[PDB]
């Protein structure tokens, strides 16, 4: 032969179904990581706006759930820079539940988001990563992201300066890009 077995299935996350689990995941990230550039845990109210922005913008929120429907992680994107000519560029994020790490869920979610990007005629995906976060950088390089550069000491967290490394993936889409 060759404990337990866990299912992961991709779903479109909805405010009704996952607001609470998503808030929980984001807050762990806020508290114990240089991932999110928040200090204070987000509120229930804040989460409501988060969903509304993704809805208005048709930003995907792709979740991975187990057999019980418990959210194991999600991946999403939003605007990278809020100016009109950045229309074909998004910034992605992926967050895994503190109980389901080191199983490769980040990679599987990222691949599903990359497929969705191609489908949505995205040209560039940008990831902003703490420059010391070796594991995340490595995951992004495995997916074909390339180091675009690093803004030194752009962030301040846990009482110290942090470097924001940017990693980008350029897709064959859109075939026919146009000005607004």
Applying CB under 5 A, the residues found at the interface with Na ion are 37, 128
Residue 144 interacting with a second copy (CB under 8 A) = no
Beta carbon of residue 16, minimum distance to a second copy (angstroms, whole number):
10
Q: Closer to a second copy at the Cβ: 33 or 120?
A: 33
Which of these segments, 52-60, 113-121, 149-157, binds a second copy (CB under 8 A)? 149-157
Residue 59 interacting with a second copy (CB under 8 A) = no
DSSP assignment string, 29-96: HHHH-SSS--SSPPPHHHHHHHHHHHHHHT--EEEEE-TT--EEEEEEEEESSSSGGGTTEEEEEEEE
Exactly one of 59, 87, 121, 143 binds a second copy (CB under 8 A); which one?
Answer: 87
Residue 161 interacting with a second copy (CB under 8 A) = yes
**Taking a C-beta distance cutoff of 8 angstroms, is the pair 48, 19 a contact?**
yes
Q: What is the DSSP letter of 161?
A: E
The pairing of strands 9-12 and 61-65 is antiparallel
Residue 3 interacting with a second copy (CB under 8 A) = yes
Within 13 Å of residue 175, how many CA atoms lie on the same side as its CB?
Answer: 1
Residue 52 interacting with a second copy (CB under 8 A) = no
Beta carbon of residue 38, minimum distance to Na ion (angstroms, whole number):
9
Beta carbon of residue 73, minimum distance to Na ion (angstroms, whole number):
18
């Amino acid at each position: 032969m060759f404990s337990t077995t866990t299912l992961f299935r991709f779903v479109e996350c909805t405010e009704d179904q996952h607001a609470l689990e998503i808030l929980e995941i984001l807050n762990d990230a806020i508290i114990n990581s240089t991932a999110l550039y928040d200090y204070k845990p987000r509120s229930k109210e804040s989460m409501a706006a988060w969903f509304a922005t993704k809805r208005q913008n048709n930003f995907p929120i792709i979740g991975a759930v187990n057999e019980v429907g418990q959210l194991l992680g999600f991946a999403s994107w939003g605007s990278f820079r809020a100016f009109p000519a950045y229309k074909y560029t998004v910034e992605h994020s992926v967050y895994i539940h503190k109980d389901y790490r080191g199983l490769g869920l980040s990679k599987h979610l990222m691949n599903e988001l990359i497929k969705r990007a191609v489908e949505s005629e995205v040209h560039v995906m940008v990831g902003c990563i703490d420059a010391t976060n070796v594991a995340s950088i490595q995951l992004h390089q495995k997916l074909g992201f390339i180091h675009s550069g690093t803004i030194q000491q752009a962030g301040f967290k846990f009482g110290r300066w942090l470097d924001a490394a940017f990693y980008q993936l350029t897709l064959d889409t859109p075939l026919h890009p146009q000005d607004d």
